[PDB]
Amino acid sequence: FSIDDVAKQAQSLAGKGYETPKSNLPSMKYADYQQIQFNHDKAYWNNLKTPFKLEFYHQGMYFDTPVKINEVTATAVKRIKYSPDYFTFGDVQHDKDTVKDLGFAGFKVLYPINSKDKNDEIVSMLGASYFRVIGAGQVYGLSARGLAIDTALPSGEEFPRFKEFWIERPKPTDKRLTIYALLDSPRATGAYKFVVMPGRDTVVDVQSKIYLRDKVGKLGVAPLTSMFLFGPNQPSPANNYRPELHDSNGLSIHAGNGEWIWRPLNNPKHLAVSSFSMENPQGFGLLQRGRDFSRFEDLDDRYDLRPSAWVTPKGEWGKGSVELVEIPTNDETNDNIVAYWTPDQLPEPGKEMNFKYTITFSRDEDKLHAPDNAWVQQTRRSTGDVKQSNLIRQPDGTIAFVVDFTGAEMKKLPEDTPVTAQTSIGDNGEIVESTVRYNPVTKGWRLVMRVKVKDAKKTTEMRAALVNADQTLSETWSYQLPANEVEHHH
Numbered sequence: 001f002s003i004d005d006v007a008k009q010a011q012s013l014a015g016k017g018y019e020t021p022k023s024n025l026p027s028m029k030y031a032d033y034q035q036i037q038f039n040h041d042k043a044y045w046n047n048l049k050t051p052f053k054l055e056f057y058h059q060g061m062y063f064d065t066p067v068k069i070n071e072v073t074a075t076a077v078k079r080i081k082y083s084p085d086y087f088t089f090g091d092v093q094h095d096k097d098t099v100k101d102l103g104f105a106g107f108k109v110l111y112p113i114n115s116k117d118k119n120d121e122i123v124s125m126l127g128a129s130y131f132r133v134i135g136a137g138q139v140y141g142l143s144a145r146g147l148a149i150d151t152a153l154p155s156g157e158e159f160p161r162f163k164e165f166w167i168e169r170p171k172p173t174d175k176r177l178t179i180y181a182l183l184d185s186p187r188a189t190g191a192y193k194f195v196v197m198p199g200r201d202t203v204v205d206v207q208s209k210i211y212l213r214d215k216v217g218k219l220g221v222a223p224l225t226s227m228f229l230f231g232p233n234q235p236s237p238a239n240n241y242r243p244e245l246h247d248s249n250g251l252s253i254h255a256g257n258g259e260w261i262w263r264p265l266n267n268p269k270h271l272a273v274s275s276f277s278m279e280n281p282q283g284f285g286l287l288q289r290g291r292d293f294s295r296f297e298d299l300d301d302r303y304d305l306r307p308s309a310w311v312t313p314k315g316e317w318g319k320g321s322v323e324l325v326e327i328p329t330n331d332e333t334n335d336n337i338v339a340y341w342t343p344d345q346l347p348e349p350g351k352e353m354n355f356k357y358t359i360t361f362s363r364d365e366d367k368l369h370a371p372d373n374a375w376v377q378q379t380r381r382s383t384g385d386v387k388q389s390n391l392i393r394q395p396d397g398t399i400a401f402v403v404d405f406t407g408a409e410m411k412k413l414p415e416d417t418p419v420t421a422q423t424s425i426g427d428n429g430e431i432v433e434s435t436v437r438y439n440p441v442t443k444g445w446r447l448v449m450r451v452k453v454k455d456a457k458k459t460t461e462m463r464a465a466l467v468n469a470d471q472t473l474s475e476t477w478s479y480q481l482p483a484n485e486v487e488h489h490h
């Protein structure tokens with residue numbers, strides 16, 4: 001069994017009219033749902049000699065369609081049948097006749113990633129083509145997807161879904177788990193081979209074969225979905241003991257031409273789409289830079305322990321854009337950040353597309369960056385004059401940003417190193433002041449940029465990179481001041 005077996009099924013589906021899935025759920029309040037729990041004593045492979053274990057999700061609410069799950073042993077492909085016996089329901093029905101047409105909603109993978117005597121979750125595959133992944137000592141944060149379609153387009157995003165999985169039984173000695181997945185969507189289908197490698201960083205190897213059943217406005221490859229409520233770049237308007245609240249705070253990109261770009265995330269008042277056009281992207285990911293607990297202070301959610309996800313393409317992906325979508329949100333309950341690679345041109349429907357890449361879920365951001373290129377540790381917004389601290393100061397139309405850089409090589413540079421800053425700003429803004437100074441506390445350099453906005457109702461974009469005389473010392477801080485962000489009222 002290989003990806004070809006799945007691809008064959010994908011190609012077939014792509015050559016026929018799309019079959020809209022039909023709900024198979026009978027009569028549910030969320031409270032009741034939370035009562036349906038998987039009997040940990042029923043973990044798949046709990047009887048096998050293998051560190052990996054499987055658990056399943058039960059249908060209910062908006063998980064109104066099932067996914068088929070098969071196990072791939074050395075000699076056979078066995079369909080893992082759904083049974084209410086895998087779960088405990090307590091208060092809910094679950095009659096062997098009321099759950100007759102039910103199947104699994106999704107599945108999770110367990111592994112002793114933290115300690116030998118505990119099978120902790122490391123992967124969760126549930127809903128559309130979404131899945132969550134974590135490394136050692138981490139807590140669930142951002143999600144990845146098998147594919148994204150027409151995201152942020154006025155015509156409406158199309159959400160493909162994984163309808164079937166093939167999980168091969170690992171040898172007792174295996175440290176990796178292979179998962180195959182069949183993806184179906186109104187205008188697209190696909191075949192995936194996932195290879196999950198748990199560790200300090202849990203790395204997922206991805207190979208896919210996508211087929212368009214019909215042309216689409218936008219194809220999102222290797223998508224990531226996260227959440228950003230507020231942070232020092234745009235602090236919470238309402239009092240909150242939490243200084244920050246987010247699963248990611250920036251989009252990191254290693255451009256086709258070698259430049260490193262860092263786009264701090266926002267929670268704009270209006271839908272924001274940012275496109276970084278390039279050819280052959282070397283890498284991109286939604287990162288969580290700054291993991292000291294004091295940035296978050298939340299003991300229940302532990303944002304400080306949530307993974308950064310870095311996508312590394314295998315091969316040349318050609319012309320397209322690493323796109324960032326920021327959605328207005330008032331709550332941390334719904335993800336508002338999306339990132340992906342979207343190709344400029346697509347081949348004719350039915351034509352096969354091959355994408356190979358790895359997704360690294362890590363807490364070692366410094367290791368997800370080139371050592372000889374400084375990165376932005378944090379971005380702090382402040383009123384125009386950074387020297388001023390008066391509490392009743394009236395807006396003077398100007399705004400400032402304190403951007404702190406640090407890095408392996410930078411930490412060694414001498415204090416008196418004449419570090420300069422190459423800046424730039426869009427037509428809607430003007431750079432009033434731009435200074436760089438050494439930070440003896442961090443052993444890095446601090447940039448203070450003050451800019452004035454011409455029209456607060458329009459978007460304002462600026463860029464800055466630390467340079468030396470002989471070279472470029474840091475990634476390019478690429479910031480966007482959302483429209484209506486610095487507007488005063490009432």
Ligand code: NA
Nearest residue numbers: 292293294295
């Ligand atoms: Na602190």
